[PDB]
Amino acid sequence: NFTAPVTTPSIPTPIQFLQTWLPGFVKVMTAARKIDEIIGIDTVG
Amino acid sequence: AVAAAESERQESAASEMSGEGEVAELISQVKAILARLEGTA
Amino acid sequence: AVAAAESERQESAASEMSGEGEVAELISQVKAILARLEGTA
Amino acid sequence: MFQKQVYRQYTPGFPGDLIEDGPKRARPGRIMSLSAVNPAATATGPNRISRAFGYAGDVSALGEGQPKTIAARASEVVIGGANFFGVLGHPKHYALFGSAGDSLAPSYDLPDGAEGEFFDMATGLVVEIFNGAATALDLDYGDLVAYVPNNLPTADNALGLPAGALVGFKAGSMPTGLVQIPNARIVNAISLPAQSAGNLVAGVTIVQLTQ
Amino acid sequence: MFQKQVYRQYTPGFPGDLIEDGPKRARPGRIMSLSAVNPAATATGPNRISRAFGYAGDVSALGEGQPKTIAARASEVVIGGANFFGVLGHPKHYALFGSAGDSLAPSYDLPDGAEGEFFDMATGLVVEIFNGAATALDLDYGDLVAYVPNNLPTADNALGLPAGALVGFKAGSMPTGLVQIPNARIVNAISLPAQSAGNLVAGVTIVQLTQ
Amino acid sequence: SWEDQEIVQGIVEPAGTAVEYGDHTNIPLTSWNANFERRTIVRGELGMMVGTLEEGRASAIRLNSAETKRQQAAIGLEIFRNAIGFYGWQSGLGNRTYGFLNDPNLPAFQTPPSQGWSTADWAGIIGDIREAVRQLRIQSQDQIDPKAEKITLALATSKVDYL
Amino acid sequence: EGRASAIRLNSAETKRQQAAIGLEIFRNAIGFYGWQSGLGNRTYGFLNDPNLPAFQTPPSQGWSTADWAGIIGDIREAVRQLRIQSQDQIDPKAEKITLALATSKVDYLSVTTPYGISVSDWIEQTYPKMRIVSAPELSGVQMKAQEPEDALVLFVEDVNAAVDGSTDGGSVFSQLVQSKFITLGVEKRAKSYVEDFSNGTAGALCKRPWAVVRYLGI
Amino acid sequence: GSTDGGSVFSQLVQSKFITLGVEKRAKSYVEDFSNGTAGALCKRPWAVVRYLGI
Amino acid sequence: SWEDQEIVQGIVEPAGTAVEYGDHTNIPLTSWNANFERRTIVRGELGMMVGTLEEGRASAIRLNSAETKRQQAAIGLEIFRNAIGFYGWQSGLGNRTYGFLNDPNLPAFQTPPSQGWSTADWAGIIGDIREAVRQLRIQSQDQIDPKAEKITLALATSKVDYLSVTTPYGISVSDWIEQTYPKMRIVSAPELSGVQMKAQEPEDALVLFVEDVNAAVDGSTDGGSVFSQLVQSKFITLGVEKRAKSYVEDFSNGTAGALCKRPWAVVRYLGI
């Protein structure tokens, strides 16, 4: 008695539209550069 | 307004009646529009 | 909208069908232009 | 993908949805996992929308020590539990995740551990119903509803029905092993053709009144 | 009396309270008296809130003359129901009358022939349910409710339960002589310990689904 | 946009049947569901390299050698676009770019009742066109305009003369 | 509502226009077949009005087995019957005449004589201003025993009021619609809301039975 | 009630012709252009009849 | 926005190695790559039904029924949000809502150098704190200096008073902490007590973590927050239903738990 549905039944909203992406990116850091803290810096050349 | 409505209506009727009948009715409506143009001026 | 690109689309369409349909659609577009002429004045 | 045909009228509804507005009772719950089911748990189901779920414990408490915070009255339900909890529904509540890479592929299956809306009672609910036998059946206004449990024995489940599949029987004809939803009635009338274990024709969706 | 221990949360509710919203049916009634029940009163209870009262006649027609006046549609109820009228609830509607020597003591009792609304239908009603057997019992979602009558023989009521006390009884373990509340279900899941005739063990507050 | 990979089109099937009105009767409710179709994007590229001596020598004969190369690049990209729109791009390898002829959501490519038109007479061609129009009307449930207004019959260029 | 609005779909708006379209389907089916006329509810349609001429059988029997001459004869006999009933109340070239057909038989107007003249060409050269429409609901109107009988209805659209003095308007048929779409109301709940709409229709009324010729089982 | 546009077939073109870049060398120069197209999409398959072998 | 189902955070890794300069020599290039992490969003709801005579008789004892029930609804939603923030929500059933003690990217809990602060003396507690700071310095590869960085010490509420352990000369742990680490902020939470079980004995928890990292030290365009409680909203009036002799109010809140974007800046100790 029910008319056969044309589209296959499915959950309506794709997940991609229900995501909030946080501002910015987290950059991967490295070891500190502390040669200037030890022996200073000099410009001679 | 009402005139434009009547025009659109008779136009859709004049689109479902053979080719000679359609062309005759369209030319008759065209002539009615020209008669109205004469009446305005 | 633009009222010209639609007119050329209708012209291409009408020229692409057979003779009676072409003459019918051309006279219908002529009637539409005449009605717009009436509306302007 | 799009309409490959044109019918004289629209379908009355899609399974899991509400057609008639009136007195209704629904509760939230978590989908759990048939694997987490301690006992054998024979009947297997993919958390389909138009299925009748069963209570399988609570997850109110949070933490891992003695002082636990009861954050919410949360129900932890399984697809074919004997203790009937509610028929899953309202597909617009959930998010489509796709199926196997195609993120836009159609899917009526809720992922495990998700949250669903389980109608305990409704004036009108579109449900997929099945045939409890291999013969053709006619369901009318005065017809009852029974859902397949998780522990339905292989001998009783000859047709290989899904886990929480609602069947739909006639007074005094409940397919064996099946457990009945009390006061559940088939409102609209339909016909199911003859089926076999391999074919298992998907019974046409039906308006049902629960409690 | 005063908070002697700080918890991580609050209780879901109190007995007689409505913890869920939805379809519900309650009717007014008068508490009548247990000393007016024709077959004496084999079970006795002090008209507590979370108790199932039953119909005991109508008091609609006012006047002792030949032409009566039906001022309002009123009914009189007794705690030991034989035909279930309703579970008394909503303790915020009443007043704290007294406790026979302590006018401000915490009491859930109603004076004889007082007002009250009794719930026929409730989305979720917090009550207390007793244990019909001396052994411990784990009540879950798929469990029913049944209330003691006043005409319960003393042999059947070995534990000495009160008149209108509600009882959870699993599904096929009904204590003898108890009166079942039709289509009543136990929503929250609790576990009651073993009890004797003297100490009983008031059942923990718990949500139930009525009709 | 040019820097995209896919285009998605949504098909929403609605649902709902009326009932007779009643003041106290329960209200029927409508609903809908949605499906989506994705098609990838093919980017064609074309360029031109022009030298100074080539510019001068070609401009001597009143030919730009840079505008003609530009419009030849445009025409080549147009040929690429037309071929993509007619046959699709690498659909056999699984590119999900189907054209006017190999779309997956099309009815199965039928055979005409009269077999080939070359051996057929006038009646066979008339029968083929009639059966095509009748099948379209039956599938469409009479959503065809008067005199088949918005109906395009596209033919092979080697068989249009058979009209 | 929020989830649907995330995919640029207004759930309320699509549900409301689906309600409108469903009421339109209800109205069209009532106008074509009537509502419960078998039970005696007294709202008939374009196909089952009580004041209509008896549903005739065409001279050529079914069009499926008929040739060009049979279809031409059926159309000619229908037009002649209409002219005789109307006592020449037909405009020049059958202007205000509508020929409604079963949707499965309109393509039989493209059936030709073996020498290249269609039924449509014959109508063009004979009744050039005759309106021709095909309706899905006009197919399978009745049952012979198991074969869905397909129908043809030839009728005058409008009759001028000068000849008779009618203040009605002159239309032969009229689909009596009380309202296409009215908003019954809104009931706003805590976390949802319900909106109810309605429509009214009294089927189709035939005011000029003489200007109708019907063939069944073409 | 469709709000897509109502067409049955649609040829999805991102851009007919874009100028990607110009590179100027010493005695010559290069200019590069591109275009994008997603093929053709059939949104109403019910309104199509196809015959092969005519 | 209370509505979205997931929250996504991106991490970018650059890559490039320099070479010695020369003209006509091939130019060395650099590149990058990106990864993403997602968490789910949990919505809780709470309501309140108030009748007419209920308010009328509640006002007799100088108590406002509707105000108390609305406050209790807000407090219940707050309890839900806090419990989710501390323990997630069905993290074990497949839901990706995690808490301050449940994040998969977090380093595993470590046994402190002292077995427990109940028996350890002042030297033991300060040694545990110093070892945690040592681990924090090693993990960051000397990029975060704890002397001049805002650093949070989150403690179980049952062990914060152990910061008052003194020597016979009057030197508490508090003096050593606030003089060695002036920017250190000590917070205590009841949820941090009895986090896990060893054998019928609750184990308390200590978490050392940097509040914020400067954009200079990492190059991040995000904000530098090591930990973030992603709360959609603490309170939304979902709606109200006025009926004849009663009315219903319904509120809701949403929360995605807690996210640790920099696991290298967290040290955890269990069982002090």
TrEMBL record, chains B, C:
Coverage span on the entire protein: 286 to 326 of 478
Top-level taxon: Viruses
Protein's name according to its UniProt entry: Capsid and scaffold protein
Organism: Pseudomonas virus Pa193
UniProtKB/TrEMBL annotation, chains D, E:
Pfam families noted in UniProt: Phage_cement
Source species, domain of life: Viruses
Protein name (Swiss-Prot/TrEMBL): Virion protein
Native species: Pseudomonas virus Pa193
TrEMBL record, chain H:
Name by which UniProt lists this protein: Capsid and scaffold protein
Species for this entry: Pseudomonas virus Pa193
